Structures are given as structure tokens and as C-alpha cells.
Design a protein around this ligand. Sequence first.
Ligand SMILES: Cc1ccc(-c2ccccc2)cc1-c1cc(/C=C/C(=O)O)ccc1O
Ligand SMILES: Cc1ccc(-c2ccccc2)cc1-c1cc(/C=C/C(=O)O)ccc1O
Ligand SMILES: [Cl-]
Ligand SMILES: [Cl-]
Lengths: 215, 214, 10, 11
Amino acid sequence: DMPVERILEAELAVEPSSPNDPVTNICQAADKQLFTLVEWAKRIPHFSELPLDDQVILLRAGWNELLIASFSHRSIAVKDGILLATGLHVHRNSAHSAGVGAIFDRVLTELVSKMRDMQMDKTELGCLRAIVLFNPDSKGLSNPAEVEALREKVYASLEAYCKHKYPEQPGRFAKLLLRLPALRSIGLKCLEHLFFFKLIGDTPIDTFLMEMLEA
Amino acid sequence: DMPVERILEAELAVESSPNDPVTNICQAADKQLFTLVEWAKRIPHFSELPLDDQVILLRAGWNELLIASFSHRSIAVKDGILLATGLHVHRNSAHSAGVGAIFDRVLTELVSKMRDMQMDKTELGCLRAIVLFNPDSKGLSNPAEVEALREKVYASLEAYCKHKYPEQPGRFAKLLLRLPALRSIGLKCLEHLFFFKLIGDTPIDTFLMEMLEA
Amino acid sequence: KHKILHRLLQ
Amino acid sequence: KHKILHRLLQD
Ligand SMILES: Cc1ccc(-c2ccccc2)cc1-c1cc(/C=C/C(=O)O)ccc1O
Ligand SMILES: Cc1ccc(-c2ccccc2)cc1-c1cc(/C=C/C(=O)O)ccc1O
Ligand SMILES: [Cl-]
Ligand SMILES: [Cl-]
């Protein structure tokens, strides 16, 4: 059983120029939000029941898309920019000056503005993130089927929520799901940036973020 | 209107050296690009889009479109991929050619999943049509029109799923949740292909090369 | 050129 | 090593 109300509670529990500023802020913010992601995941029904090694696999496989989804939704208010968890507003000129111009543009066009235009709410965000968390494709899971079953419960509850809350939008549930391919390829490009930040020494060492990159 | 029957019609109308798999991958992808164009024309309303947008959509999606097709074609293969050349790529061979990791992902994330749910040709065609009408593609003169066509496809697929598999209320969602894997597998296959190009494995002057250098 | 696709779409 | 995540999960 997978109540959207618990998933909303999880969301609300955790979520209220130098060319070098965006990269510094992105590394700080990503690390900060990893500790917070663990508290979020534990509040998702049944995640803490999973074997420890599976919880580890799922967060290692999903943290990046999980965080990208969150800062994208948080940015619905920002005029043409990203709101990092460090409070820094990355805008277009700064992002291009920092070497992350192209992914800046994709994040706004493929995630933030689409989230903004459909008025994706925090229940919908949280269900999509729960779906990403419960990723049955993750490698090494001791029981991919129970993770798949949990994923199924999430999007079942999500669909029923959308049909009950937005009765006039029958395609809304599909539209939410169809934003996950974008999230997948944006996550890969963001990750590629991190590895380059690591290679050149922009990432602080000995952090939880560095563990995600080294594990 | 976006009748699921036309989409199935489009599907049905078109469908040991370490060095063999890469040679065959390149020959197969190039071959299936020509067939892919004929497929796309059979998708309702695609041919009515401006030419430049039709070009943008096929260049943005041909790779995932072809991967969806050989993955579904491989349901019958035992632990392997059936390429359009007729070569059955199996695991040891894939690893000896440098495509071992992606081989494993395609089998676990696409072929096996297509097989276990018995994805039918109408479902495959509707997923490919959704991929085709990708409103995120860069440079579309009118993304909103492409998004509208996408929407018509998944409305039709959903209703198809509900009337053919009444007992499986999650089937429509399950079909769509295979697109994120198709996205990252496509990106990995594309990275292989740019490497094959770099090192001179790709034949020159082909339709595949046009996709890589347009 | 890169018009292989364009000519086939006709 | 790389057990930051493990220890956080363990409460
Ligand atoms: C690594 C990276 C590289 C580039 C970008 C980027 C840059 C410009 C525009 C849009 C995105 C984001 C992250 C990243 C940040 C976060 C921060 C989250 C937060 O502040 O809440 C988490 C994960 C990430 O992958
Ligand atoms: C580029 C690549 C690299 C690697 C692989 C690969 C390797 C091992 C197992 C599974 C897949 C496939 C393609 C590729 C093939 C085709 C051939 C399709 C067909 O035969 O129908 C089309 C697009 C592609 O990206
Ligand atoms: Cl969409
Ligand atoms: Cl799934």
C-alpha cells in the first residue's frame, strides 16, 4: 500500500558574478542535498523495509535524477534560472560563463518550464521521485521484483491522484511519466559534468558527493 | 485522429572474429534507416508536418527508434540480439567486440522486459510513434503541434491497452516507463557509434554517417 | 549536402 | 571504504 499523502509528507518534510560561482555552488548544493535525500527516502513507504544493500543500490543509482527533479521543481518560480539549494540563482549568462550553458538550456526547456506550464504540484513531484527511487533496472538488487512492485504501487496511486484531482486532464498522468526520459538524459549530462569537475579539482574532496562518484 | 490500427499497419509493412559484431551493427543500422523513413511516412499525420520538422524528428529519434525495433525483434532469440543483417549477436561475441556492457543492458532493460510482458506489435508501434513525435527535439518550428500528435498517440495506446488487457491496469504505465531505459541505452549506443566513427570502423558516405555528422 | 533524408522523405 | 551512505541509512 502506497498513499500519496505519505509521499507528499516526505516532500514537505525536507523541502521548504564570478564564472566560478555556479560550479562551486553546484558542488556544495549537491552534497548538501544528498544528506537530505536519505531522510526523504526513509520517509517513502516501504523503502526502509528493503534490505540495506538494496537501499544503497537504489540511492546510488537514483540520487542524481532525484536531486535534478527537486531543483527543477523548486525553480518554477525563478525567472529564466535555477534555484540551487545553496540559495544561489544560476541564470543563463553565468551558466554559460561557467561551462554548463547547454545543460542549463535543456533543464529549463525540458524540465522547469514544462513543470511550470502544467503546474506540477508537490504530490506529483514526490510520486515521480518515488518512481525513480524504486528503479527496478538498478544493477545488483537482491529482488528486482519487490522494487518493481513498489514502483507499480507508486504510479497506481499517482494516476488515481491525478484523475481525482485534475479530472479535466485525462492525459496528465501520461504527461508526468513522459518527463522521465528527459530526466534520464539530463541526469547523464549533469553526471558527466561532475566527473569533469572531479578530474580538474573543482569538487571538494572527502564528501558524500565524492563517495557517490567513487563508489 | 490517431488510429492505433494505422500504427500497427506501419510496423507490419516494414518488419567468429571479434570484428563481426561491429561490422554488422554498422551495416544493420544503415540498412534500417532507409526502412525507418518508410515507416515514419506511414504514421498518421507525420508526413503532413513541415519537411524541416520531419527531418528534425527523424534525426532526433532514429537511434532509439531502431533500438526499440531490434530489441523487440530479439524476443525470440535466446540470450542475444537479432540484427537486421541476420547476425545473432550473443554475449561472448558482444564482449569480444567491445559492446559487452550495452549488450547486457539491452537484454535486461529492453528485450527481457518486452518478452515478460508480451509487448505486442501495436504497443511497440505506439511507443515508437511517441518517440518519433518528440516535442523536446531542438529546432522544431512548432513543438506544440508535435506534442499534440504525441498526446494523440498515447491516448490511443492507453485505450488500446485498456480494451485488450482489461486485467492489467498498470500496463499502459509500464509501457511508458520503458522509455527512460530506451533513452539511456540510445545514448550509450550512440557513444559507441561515434567511437566506431573515430577509429574508422563505420563505412563512409552512408546514411548512417549523415545522421552522425548532420 | 546531408540531404539523403530529405530526398527519401519525398 | 565509502560507507557514508550505509551509516546514514542505519540511523
Ligand atoms: C552536477 C550538476 C551539473 C550541472 C548542473 C546544472 C547546471 C546549470 C543548469 C542546470 C543544471 C547541475 C548539477 C547538479 C546539481 C545538483 C544541485 C541540487 C540542488 O541545489 O538542490 C544536484 C545534482 C546535479 O547533477
Ligand atoms: C550503434 C550500436 C552500438 C551497439 C549496439 C549493441 C551492441 C550489443 C548489444 C546490443 C546493441 C547497437 C547499436 C545499434 C544497432 C542498430 C541495428 C539495428 C538493427 O539491426 O535492426 C541500430 C542502432 C544502434 O545504435
Ligand atoms: Cl511529452
Ligand atoms: Cl518499470
